[PDB]
Every structure is written in C-alpha cells, then in structure tokens.
Design an enzyme around this catalytic site. Sequence first.
Site, mmCIF file in Angstrom:
data_model
loop_
_atom_site.group_PDB
_atom_site.id
_atom_site.type_symbol
_atom_site.label_atom_id
_atom_site.label_comp_id
_atom_site.label_asym_id
_atom_site.label_seq_id
_atom_site.Cartn_x
_atom_site.Cartn_y
_atom_site.Cartn_z
ATOM 1 C CG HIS C 50 -0.366 0.392 2.492
ATOM 2 N ND1 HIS C 50 -0.018 -0.529 3.451
ATOM 3 C CD2 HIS C 50 -0.075 1.611 3.005
ATOM 4 C CE1 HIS C 50 0.480 0.105 4.506
ATOM 5 N NE2 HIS C 50 0.452 1.399 4.260
ATOM 6 C CG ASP C 80 -0.108 -4.014 2.798
ATOM 7 O OD1 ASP C 80 0.110 -3.652 1.619
ATOM 8 O OD2 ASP C 80 -0.220 -3.201 3.740
ATOM 9 C CB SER C 154 3.606 1.745 6.021
ATOM 10 O OG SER C 154 2.478 1.910 6.878
ATOM 11 C CB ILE C 208 -9.206 -26.152 -2.047
ATOM 12 C CG1 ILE C 208 -9.363 -25.458 -0.696
ATOM 13 C CG2 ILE C 208 -7.853 -26.824 -2.136
ATOM 14 C CD1 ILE C 208 -9.213 -26.389 0.466
ATOM 15 N N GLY C 209 -10.992 -23.342 -2.898
ATOM 16 C CA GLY C 209 -12.304 -22.728 -2.977
ATOM 17 C C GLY C 209 -13.211 -23.139 -1.835
ATOM 18 N N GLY C 211 -14.458 -21.899 2.336
ATOM 19 C CA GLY C 211 -14.429 -21.094 3.540
ATOM 20 C C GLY C 211 -14.629 -22.012 4.729
ATOM 21 N N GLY C 212 -13.601 -22.150 5.555
ATOM 22 C CA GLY C 212 -13.654 -23.105 6.643
ATOM 23 C C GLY C 212 -13.100 -22.610 7.960
ATOM 24 N NE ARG C 213 -13.875 -19.076 12.065
ATOM 25 C CZ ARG C 213 -14.723 -18.607 11.155
ATOM 26 N NH1 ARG C 213 -15.910 -19.179 10.994
ATOM 27 N NH2 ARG C 213 -14.387 -17.563 10.407
ATOM 28 C CE1 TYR C 291 -6.893 -17.415 -1.693
ATOM 29 C CE2 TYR C 291 -6.987 -15.426 -3.019
ATOM 30 C CZ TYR C 291 -7.340 -16.121 -1.887
ATOM 31 O OH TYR C 291 -8.138 -15.509 -0.945
#
Lengths: 284, 296, 294
Positions: C50, C80, C154, C208-209, C211-213, C291
């Site tokens: 940034h 970033d 930064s 792999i597409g 969303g997990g937890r 990705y």
Amino acid sequence: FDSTDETPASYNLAVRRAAPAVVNVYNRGLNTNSHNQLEIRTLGSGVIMDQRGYIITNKHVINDADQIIVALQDGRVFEALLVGSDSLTDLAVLKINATGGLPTIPINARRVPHIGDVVLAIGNPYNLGQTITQGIISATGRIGLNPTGRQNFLQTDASINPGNSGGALVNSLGELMGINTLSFDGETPEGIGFAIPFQLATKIMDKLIRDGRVIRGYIGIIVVNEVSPDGPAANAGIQVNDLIISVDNKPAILETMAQVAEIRPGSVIPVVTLQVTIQEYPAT
Amino acid sequence: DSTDETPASYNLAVRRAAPAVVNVYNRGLNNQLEIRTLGSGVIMDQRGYIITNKHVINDADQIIVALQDGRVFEALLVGSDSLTDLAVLKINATGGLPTIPINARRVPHIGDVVLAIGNPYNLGQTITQGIISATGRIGLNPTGRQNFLQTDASINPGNSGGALVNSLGELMGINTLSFDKSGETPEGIGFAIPFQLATKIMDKLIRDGRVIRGYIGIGGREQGIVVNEVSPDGPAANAGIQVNDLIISVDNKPAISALETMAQVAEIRPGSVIPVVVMRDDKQLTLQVTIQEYPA
Amino acid sequence: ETPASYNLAVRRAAPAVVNVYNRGLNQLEIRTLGSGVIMDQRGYIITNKHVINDADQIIVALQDGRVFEALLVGSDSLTDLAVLKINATGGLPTIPINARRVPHIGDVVLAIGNPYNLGQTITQGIISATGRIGNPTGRQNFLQTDASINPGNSGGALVNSLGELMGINTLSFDKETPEGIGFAIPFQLATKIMDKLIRDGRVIRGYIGIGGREIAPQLQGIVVNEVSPDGPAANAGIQVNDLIISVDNKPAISALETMAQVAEIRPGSVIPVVVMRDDKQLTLQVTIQEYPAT
C-alpha cells in the site's frame, strides 16, 4: 557480528509470571430495547488475587451487568458472581467456581513502588486479546482526574485503553503494583494513566470478601462547621464552631478521615474531653 | 520468590534530576494575579538561573517559580530568545538550590533511554520514559534550523521548559514542542532543545540581554547556494552581491547545505571580515563582506 | 558510568532501513511515502504494497545519502507486501536477520521508519502480543507492539535490542484515540513472501475454494462453511457442513496450518481430501487451482 549467542532485553519473565492471572471481563446485558438478545455493553479486565477464585476489577466495568463473564488466558470461561463493590475506590470483587486451581498474581507486600520503576500494563484493550504494554511509574499519590475524592493513585505512561480497566500493572519481576482504572483525557493527552495502588486494592478486597461491602467508621462531623443530626458527632455534645485537636490519641494535623474510616463501628474514642462511640457510615 | 530480586528502574535518574525541575507560573493582571499559562523550568546553576521556554513566559505580568521542596519564588526575566524559544529566569534564593546534573562530555546517542520531567496539565511533577528518536531535527517548521532532539517520551502541555535527562540524570535537553498536526493524532513525537545548545544560549543571555548572531543579508536555497534575495543596505548588499549568483563557500568553508551555512554565519561575531566565494556568469569571485548583528 | 541505551541495535539495523517515496503526476508529486528494509546484498528491499501502489516512479533513499530509483519486483496484496530492487555499485547495508530467533511477548523492540517524512525515526516499546489477526483473511498473523507508529512507518523495521529484524511495521489500530497499538508482519512470513516474490514475480498460491473454520474440541478438522462456485472443491463434490479431516495426506488439525499447506500445492495437482458427511468418511479428489486474482 553474531548475535545468535546474545540475549534480547526482555520483560517476558514478568509476563510469564503475571499474565496467566489477568482475566478478560465481559459485562453482558439483555437488549430490552430490541429482542432481549445478550450483548456486551462493557468489557474490561480483572486480576485473580487468590486460588479460591477471588478476582479484582473496577466497579465501573461491572455496573449494570445482567451477566458477568470471566475468560482466562488458558481458554476457560466462567460466569462470575459479584461478591461486592465499593464506589469510593471504584473497586469490585468477583468470584469464580473453578474446580481446578487457578493462577494468581504475584504479590509482594513488602515491595515499595518507586517513581521511575518500569511497569507492564496487562489487559484486554478493545477486545483484541490480552495485551502487554510498557511504561514507568510516573508519580504516586495522585488522586486522579476528579478533584479530591480522597483517592491515592499511581500514575503511569504505559499505554492504557478502553478494556484495560480492572487489569494489572506489574513491575519487571511480575509483582502487582496496581489496578489500572482511569485514563486522563482540543489536544489529546498522551501517556497519562492511573492505577489503584496494590496495597489499597488488597485492603479493600479483604473487606469486601468479609462483609460483602466496605464498612467505614463514621464521626458525624481542624475547625468544625457542620455536625450531622443525631450522629456519633452530634452526641458527646459536640458543638458547631467547636474545635478539635486530637482524635483517638492522634494529632489532628483528610488524614483524620482516613484514620476514622478504618475504625471499627462500636469502638469508643475520646476527643476535644468528648466521648464518642464510632458507628458505621451508610454510603448507599 | 521475587522478594529478594531487584525491579528494573530509573528511580536513580529521577532522584538526581527531578528536584531541579520546577513549576513555572505566568501571572497576568486584569489587580488580581491570574495564571495565564504554566510550564516547567530547570535550575542550571547555584546562582538561581533557570531555563524555560519563551512562549511560557510571554507577556507575563508576574512570574512565579515553585520547587519540589516547597519553596516558592518570584522570578525575574533575565532575557528571552524568540528563535530558539528559550528564556532565562533569576530567583534570589537562600540556603542554595538543587541543580540539574550536567556532563559536557556526554554525546547524546540515538537510542539512549530518556526521561521527561515536568508538570503536565498542572497535575504535579510527572516522569515519562522513552528514547532519543533522532537528532538535528528542524521540527514542525522547516525554517529556523532548530536542531531539536526528537523523543518518543510522552510530552504534554505543562512539560514546556522542563528537563529531558538520561538514565544517569544528566540533562539531554529542554522539552519544547509536540507534534500535533494530521484527523491524525501523532503519537510519540516531541522535540527538545539539546542541552549543549541550551547552555550556550543561556550564557549569552546572562552576558547580554539578548542573543547576538551574524547577519549577511541573504535569502537563498541549495554544489552551491543561490541568492534569491539580497537584503538592501545589508552586509552582502554593501559587498555588492547580486541576485541569482551562486555562493560556493563562506569563510573558507564550502557551502554544501544552506542549513549548515546559516548556522555558521550566526556564530561569526558581528564586524568580522570574511571571504565569500561566488560563481557569476560561470566565473569565480572572492568578495569581502563585513558581518553585522542579526536585526531585532 | 554509561547511560542505558539501545544505540547498538540502532547502529546495527537502522542503516538498512530506507525512505520510500511513491510519486505520480497530478509533473511528479509524492502521493505516498513510507519505509523499506534492505534484506540482502543484491539490493532487494521489502516494503508494504500500500506504500508503493499505483506508483509512476519509486524513489528509495538511504541514510548514507545515496538515492536510487527502485524497480518493482513484485507485490502481494493478501499479505500487503512488496519487493523493490535497486542496483548499487557500492556495497549495501543489510538488515540483521536471525532465522533461529523466536520473538517473545515482552521483548523490547524499536520501530525504525520515516513518520511524516521527518527523517528516520526510532521509537521504543515492547512486543504486546503475537498471532494477532488484523483482518478476516487470516493471512497476516501480526506481531502487536506499542512502539509509537505513525503514517510513514509502513514498510519499516521492527527490531529487537540486538538489531535483529522482528517484523515489518504495517498497521496502526485506528478504531477516542487508541494509544500504543500497532502491528507488524513477522519476519519469518516476510522472508517467505520475499523469496517467493523474487522468484516468480508474484506469490503463486494453491487454492481449493473453501471457507472453513476448525471447531473447538467428534473428529477434529475444518468445517466447510462456504464452497466457492465452480471452485476446485465444488467441482469435486465437497459440500457445506462436512468436516475436512485430511488434505493431501496430511491431518486437518488447524485451519491456518492447512491453509498454509494448500498454498504450497502446485496448481493442477490432483489431491485426496477426506471429509465427514453423515458420520461417514468420504474421500474426494480435488484439482488445485491458482488462487483467484484480487
């Protein structure tokens, strides 16, 4: 150069000693404006003062709570019982009922804090998770933001934020110096925070655990100007415009009121010789 | 059992230096003395000469000074210097005074631990800790070549004119300015006048009711230094220096940076005769200029 | 008698921290500025993405006076980070780096950067916490510190009292005015991303597409919450609410640990994925993709 053998300057030792015993406190309330959903209305920190599970925090952290949740760094979570509070010192005591023992904050009753001493603040600022910040003791006996109030504060420049209230201020050895309570605040004050000295915190905690409240001796009245109606002061025939020079065999040199406050209700004490029986002062 | 161990501390520094830092109160009549401002000050020597900031004592009808030990004096203004924002005070004391430890051998290093001592928000004497962040900083304003020490030790209103010391209690500087500009609340950026520079300014104020600097009547930018303006009837004007000619060196010293040169000219005693090499029309000329004192 | 000081760490590390200027034509005006760290002799520099975003020209200035025009080697918005390259005939100072060093909470640290373009500033604090998210991406894993940080820090260095790089100062908590809460990218992650950027021009990540937890302590593993449409997972028939127990022949113990493992898998690879559906172990085969671009 080679610094692999060298050792980084660090207060990790103080952290390993104290941090396990500082807890996250959550003041939860039913949203009676909406649909009674349980919401966090205030969060803060607390210090586990002994193995039995007695915890110190600020009264203002737990005011108006419908439920008080205590979370430990080891992941355990407890509903806490309010043992007692004291608005004059903004202190409160919680009790958790863990079967397994629990970590306690190192406390050195003989240690005298000194201006210039390195300190570490330990709390849950903005609910980020336990946070350790570093400063020094900036001053002692401060009395805080509010004028008078008969309060003795350690001042510190360890960065302190909403969420730190009720948490620990310790030295490089991990010993408890105080309970972080208050931040000073067109400019924005930088590095001015206040803590209740530990000697006072331990004193109030013991009283709260014992009586469920802090009982202070009362006189009912160094020149006098007003005498409370039918108070211990009014009795013993104390007069308006009356003058007092000694109390309980001590020089009437704020100091008197701190002395009388500790005095147990029921005890009798001579003054000028007017004989007065100390009674409990009702704060509400 | 930490009972037998020793806590990390800077108490030593506090004990040596703090007694010498005072509260300064600026009174203004409107028949009653009213605090119009307040700040801090440092006792430099046994005579009772105190350093503070000019902005603290500006337009004071009466200046009160209070010591940590309890004594209270009415101070008199020896002198003040607008440029460096310094002022010197005198109090007639009895039984002597505490003084700020000074080591002229000590060269402040970036990274040195430092304590700020002062009276933030009139709370009472406060000690805050940080390090030296940089040296020779121009500060908030590019102009003036301030040569500030920069520190991340917390400074607030009330710290002005107060002491910045190292872990030995030795005076590193005089807290003077805080960065307050964006919105953005800057964190840990304050400026002190280095102690060496502060000593010099004091002595020149005690000797003369002001600070005397060398003037050469030139306004320029940056190797050489172009002359954008030439002060009329000034030292350089009389010497015949023209606008748009490049200055190569002054007094046998090459003029690489405009900031370092203007620092050198201030040092030169007024009336001194010096060489000034310049480049004009791709030619080299060594003029002779007579320095005058910087206009009030 | 010597004053307490961190000058040593300063003398060791500061020379390797540069002022970074991002310019564009509104001719060229400075649109952003920050700091950067010289990592190796070849002249590769690390900074935040940034800081150098949308730069027409990137100027890098060293503390010894030299000034270069930097080449943008690569950037990665997920962490970033960005790598610059400067070509120096003379030797370059480098940041001290100790791969074995484990940062601990309470370690004294120094932030080295260029706040408000005042010039290289050093501020002091400690390590306040580790493994801090933010950021739901879960790809930054910050060190938290209370060394004063301001706009301009930064890309700059967070070092310990030995001048050893601890991290790259990246973020300041802005949500009254918060005091002493800043975040840095840990050096281990900074280095990993640097070498990858230098090598491939960008960070090539497996994907792999999903969303997990991970759950709290029932078989342990990652619960699938979302399944990216037409992603590798959706195609192989993985569904919401099944439990991932194994990925490419490694136990799914931690969502973070697994996510770091998936990233390492080369796109196109066909891998076994074992899940729990209705108390039955299912083995699905997913073809890893790269990705998705930001």
